[PDB]
Amino acid sequence: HMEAVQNRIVEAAERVPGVRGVIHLRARYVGQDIWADMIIGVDPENTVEQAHEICEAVQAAVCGKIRRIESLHVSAEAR
Amino acid sequence: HMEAVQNRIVEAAERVPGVRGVIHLRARYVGQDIWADMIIGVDPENTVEQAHEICEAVQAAVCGKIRRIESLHVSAEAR
């Protein structure tokens, strides 16, 4: 039930330009809502500002596809 | 007592090349040891890899100056 949602989250993140994998995804229910935290991989040669833009793009992409999510935080690490 | 340690932490971080402020510092005692978490500001045009190197440098600088610290995590955001 949750694994199906986790899979949809990872797939949505991986379709955003600049994502080099999902390093980490924590997702849990608060009532019927999902609260999640994730770390994406990015090109180490991207700027801090570009990494920020990719994170934002993932947040928007994931939240737009998975409507039960009411909190999502995305950070980036080199990969 | 803790504020004096927090001040030493911020000052140690600010002396590392590439640090553009301390955005966030949480520090608490676990017994006599300090466990801390901090966010530094960095140039948005630095690479992800450079930001990583600055974080490492801050970790080493802070831990070397403040000997009671037994856990320190450092991350970076644009500023």
Numbering used by the authors:
A (entry chain A), B (entry chain A): 213 to 291
Published text:
One group of metal ion efflux transporters that regulates metal ion homeostasis and can be found in all domains of life is the Cation Diffusion Facilitator (CDF) protein family. One of the most highly conserved and abundant integral MM proteins is the CDF transporter MamM. MamM was recently proposed to function as a magnetosome-directed iron transporter required for iron biomineralization since its deletion abolished magnetite biomineralization and mutation of residues within the conserved TMD metal-binding site resulted in alterations of magnetite crystal size, morphology and even mineral phase. To summarize our results we present an alternative model for the CDF CTD mode of action, in which we propose that upon metal cation binding, the CTD induces conformational changes towards a tighter and more compact fold which allows the activation of iron transport through the TMD.
Each MamM monomer (residues 215–293) adopts the metallochaperone-like typical fold of CDF CTDs whilst the C-terminal tail (residues 294–318) is disordered and could not be traced in the electron density map. To validate that the disordered C-terminal tail have no effect on the domain fold, we determined the structures of a C-terminal truncation MamM-CTD mutant (residues 215–293) that adopted a similar CTD fold. As observed previously, the decreased number of particles per cell was at least partially a consequence of a substantial number of cells within the population that remained non-magnetic (10–20%). These previous studies also revealed that transcomplementation of a truncated C-terminal tail MamM mutant also allows the formation of wild-type-like particle. ITC measurements of the CTD single point mutants and the C-terminal truncation mutant revealed that the binding affinities remained in the same order of magnitude as the wild-type, with some alternation in the number of binding sites.
